[PDB]
Swiss-Prot record:
Part of the ribosomal stalk of the 50S ribosomal subunit. Interacts with L10 and the large rRNA to form the base of the stalk. L10 forms an elongated spine to which 3 L12 dimers bind in a sequential fashion forming a heptameric L10(L12)2(L12)2(L12)2 complex. Forms part of the ribosomal stalk which helps the ribosome interact with GTP-bound translation factors. The lineage of its organism: Bacteria, Thermotogati, Thermotogota, Thermotogae, Thermotogales. GO terms for cellular component: cytosolic large ribosomal subunit. One of its GO terms (molecular function) is structural constituent of ribosome. It holds the Pfam family Ribosomal_L11. This is Large ribosomal subunit protein uL11. The gene is rplK. It comes from the Bacteria. One of its GO terms (biological process) is translation. InterPro entries: Ribosomal_uL11 (IPR000911), Ribosomal_uL11_bac-typ (IPR006519), Ribosomal_uL11_C (IPR020783), Ribosomal_uL11_C_sf (IPR036769), Ribosomal_uL11_CS (IPR020785), Ribosomal_uL11_N (IPR020784), Ribosomal_uL11_N_sf (IPR036796). The keyword Iron does not apply.
Length: 141
């Protein structure tokens, strides 16, 4: 399969909010890459996971072409989107700040399957759950 890797541009970038600030411009642009192609790409792709410093990895090719991936991380990311801590709880924090549910675990586990390096989702579920557990997040059902 066609690979002509010229470089790699790893970048932690706001979902829905990437831009040629010191992050992007110097990173990709120095390697000849269309920052706007990148940005209009990452932004549109990350539209859903917006509000988020996404851990990205760019792989620019010989053409000045590129592609990039975004490491849908251990679980913290979408556990915000579940545990209910996209900012924080109002006050309730019995050590368990907020919580979710095995099913919620699953979904999160599923979406980040490519990242968590899941042989099988049961494994990814462990990650999410364990992450959650460590983060003071309970799972309830």
């Amino acid at each position: 399969m066609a690979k002509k890797v010229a470089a790699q541009i790893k970048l932690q970038l706001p979902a829905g909010k990437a831009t040629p600030a010191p992050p992007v411009g110097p990173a990709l642009g120095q390697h000849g890459v269309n920052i706007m192609e990148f940005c209009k790409r990452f932004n549109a792709e990350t539209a859903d996971k917006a509000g988020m410093i996404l851990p990205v990895v760019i792989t620019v090719y010989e053409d000045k072409s590129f592609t990039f991936i975004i490491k849908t991380p251990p679980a913290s990311f979408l556990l915000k989107k579940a545990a209910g801590i996209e900012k924080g709880s109002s006050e309730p924090k019995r050590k368990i700040v907020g919580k979710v549910t095995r099913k919620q675990i699953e979904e999160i586990a599923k979406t980040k399957m490519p990242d968590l390096n899941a042989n099988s989702l049961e494994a990814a579920m462990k990650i999410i759950e364990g992450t959650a557990k460590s983060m003071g997040i309970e799972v309830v059902d």
